Structure 1
Amino acid sequence: EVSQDLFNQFNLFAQYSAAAYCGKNNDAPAGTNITCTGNACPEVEKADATFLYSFEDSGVGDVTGFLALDNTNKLIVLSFRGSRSIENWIGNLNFDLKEINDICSGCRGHDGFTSSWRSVADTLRQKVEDAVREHPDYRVVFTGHSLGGALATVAGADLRGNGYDIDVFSYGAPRVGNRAFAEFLTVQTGGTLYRITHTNDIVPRLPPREFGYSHSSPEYWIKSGTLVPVTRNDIVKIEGIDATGGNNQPNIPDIPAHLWYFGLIGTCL
């Protein structure tokens, strides 16, 4: 159900997302080869991919990630790590909205996601700008898993428009705000958001719609199970804001489903 070219992209960026968690890169010197433990990011190691800027517990909501240079794939990748211990994050998750009129008219988004990014926006926007300068030809891609999918989606919605297309690839990210914010992210030009979901992952079901939240469209749903290899025939595109029968279905959600996106993610062997 999706193309090989999209599958390969989905795969790479899951690993850039898995590398946020899986070591060396929570803070390591610039220009250094990006590497993971326990086979989390072998397509990243295959490339000439190095760090530009590593950050850790930055900003108000403690944002951890790395900005990278990938000369093989010709990318400029800004990756965000989800929470260090996710089970707790989910449970402690507050559903408070807060306005974000600077991103889009009449848009409210998750107050925490929104304030954390808002707090590192200027340093990170800056760092992304110098990379664009140095490599005008390179594709600018934001990505993250979980909470990092949120942050990469909120940073993508906010930085697009300044002359460089921003592609977002988010893995099991939670909803990020209201219908209007959903509509903005569905149609916001200057980049494509690839909201990737997996079977019954619980994170995408949060925060609930009942608290004023909506999802972007479309959705790329992986149907293979936890710990099952993913192929191009296991992903199906699902169209419609708040669409159903992809992750958003009435059955019992699950945590282990959240840690398997193409491979192990959100946790390091």
Structure 2
Amino acid sequence: EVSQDLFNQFNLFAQYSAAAYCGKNNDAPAGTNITCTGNACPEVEKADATFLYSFEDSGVGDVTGFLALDNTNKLIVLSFRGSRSIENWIGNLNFDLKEINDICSGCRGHDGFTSSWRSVADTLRQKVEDAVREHPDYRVVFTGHSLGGALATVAGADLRGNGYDIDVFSYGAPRVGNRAFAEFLTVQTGGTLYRITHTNDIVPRLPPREFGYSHSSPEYWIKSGTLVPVTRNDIVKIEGIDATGGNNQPNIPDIPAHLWYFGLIGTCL
């Protein structure tokens, strides 16, 4: 169980995350209304939500996503898309750690996620700063599914401490580095990280703890099944760095579970 208000937020950013895949913004001019194909993001459509900036295959890591202004909910949202071919991305995923002392001390992060962020960091930092100046009253939220969740998470840890809170909602995000990072993300100030997982979704189980990785705490574990609707009553907050008994069980994992976070995500009907 989690609060209704938290549940509403989890649903909304799952949709903002779903929109990184299913919205029609390839080269949508800034100012367009955010809309999605196949009932992907109805809450988002319902808000006065427009694009601030849309990016695609950006930088070294082919980072894709968008920055949005939502006047209804008073948000600045930076949404990272995950892989366009998830199963592949999963089997092609290396486990290499890299030092990331310039974000936290003795921190080691995943090499590909930290790099891809690093390469787009300055352009996007700038773009959040602008929006924040233009709407000082709005909450800044970073969000993402899968790879997008990892990115989001790395970018929040990176850009916090600069005079505006950054909240992060990740959905099915992989592990992003070492126990020291997990600790940094557990305790850091200047915002909250909400790490959402589903059932036996495989992706938050990777890269393995046996490659030196750990999970930040806490974890919001969706227990309800794939293609089942989520209620506030189906989400358990799991406390403890690499707590087990949430998604971190030694049972057998699943890919489909990864594509159902409140609604269909990481794929478009």
Q: TM-score range by the shorter chain?
A: over 0.9
CA distance in 1, matches of 2:204, 2:46: 30
Structure 1 residues without counterparts, runs of 5 or longer: none
> Pairwise mapping of residues 173-192 of structure 1 onto structure 2 (< 5 A)?
173-192=173-192
Residues 19 and 25, structure 1, Cα contact 8 Å, conserved in 2: no
Q: CA offsets, 1:226-263, max 9 Å, x none?
A: 00000010001000000000000010000000000000
How many Å separate the matches in 2 of 1:166 and 1:212? 27
Q: Work out the number of aligned pairs and report it.
A: 269
Partner Cα distance (1:242, 1:225) in 2: 22
Q: List per-residue Cα deviations over 1:51-76 (Å, max 9, x = no partner).
A: 00000000101000000000000000
How far residue 26 of structure 1 moved from its aligned partner, in angstroms, is 3.6
Q: Quick one: distance in 1 between partners of 2:36 and 2:108?
A: 36
**Counterpart-to-counterpart distance in 1, 2:222 and 2:57:** 31
CA distance in 1, matches of 2:38, 2:258: 18
Distance across 2 between alignment mates of 1:200 and 1:82: 19
Maintained 8 Å contact 1:26/1:65: no
Contact 1:35 1:41 in 2 (8 A): yes
Residue 114, structure 1, aligned to residue 90, structure 2: no
Q: Secondary structure at the match of 1:196?
A: strand
- Asked if the contact 2:160/2:191 (under 8 Å) is kept, the reply is yes
Identity among equivalent pairs (%): 100
1:169 equivalent in structure 2: 169
Q: CA–CA distance in 1 between the matches of 2:205 and 2:232?
A: 24
How far did 1:81 drift?
0.1
Distance in 2 between residues matched to 1:97 and 1:218, nearest whole Å: 22
Q: CA shift at 1:133, angstroms?
A: 0.3
Q: Distance in 1 between matches of 2:56 and 2:82?
A: 12
Q: Tell me how far 1:24 sits from its aligned partner.
A: 1.1
Structure 2: gaps of 5 or more residues: none
Partner Cα distance (1:23, 1:43) in 2: 13
Q: Distance in 2 between matches of 1:216 and 1:185?
A: 6
Task: Deviation per CA, 1:158-196: give whole Å up to 9, x if none.
Answer: 000000100000000000000000000000000000000
Counterpart contact for 1:107–1:180, Cα < 8 Å: yes
Moved over 3 A (4+): none
Do the aligned partners of 1:179 and 1:215 also contact (CA within 8 Å) in 2? Answer: yes
Per-residue Cα deviation, 1:17-38 (whole angstroms, up to 9, x for no partner): 0000003124311010000000
TM-score, normalisation: structure 2? 0.99
3-state SS of the aligned residue for 2:8?
A: helix
Superposition CA RMSD, Å: 0.5
Contact 1:26 1:64 in 2 (8 A): no
Task: Describe the superposition over 1:190-229 as per-residue Cα deviations: whole angstroms up to 9, x where unpaired.
Answer: 0000000000000000000000000000000001000000
Q: TM-score, normalising length from structure 1?
A: 0.99
Would you say the 8 A contact 2:23–2:34 is kept in 1?
no
For residues 162 and 26 of structure 2, the distance between their equivalents in structure 1, rounded to whole angstroms, comes to 28
Counterpart Cα distance in 1 of 2:119 and 2:183: 24
- CA deviations over 1:66-116 (Å, ceiling 9, x no partner): 000000000000000000000000000000000101100000000000000
2:266 counterpart residue number:
266
**1:44 CA displacement:** 0.2
1:114-140 per-residue CA deviation (whole Å, 9 max, x = no partner) reads: 000000000000000000000000000
Instruction: Tell me which moved more, 157-166 or 24-33.
Output: 24-33
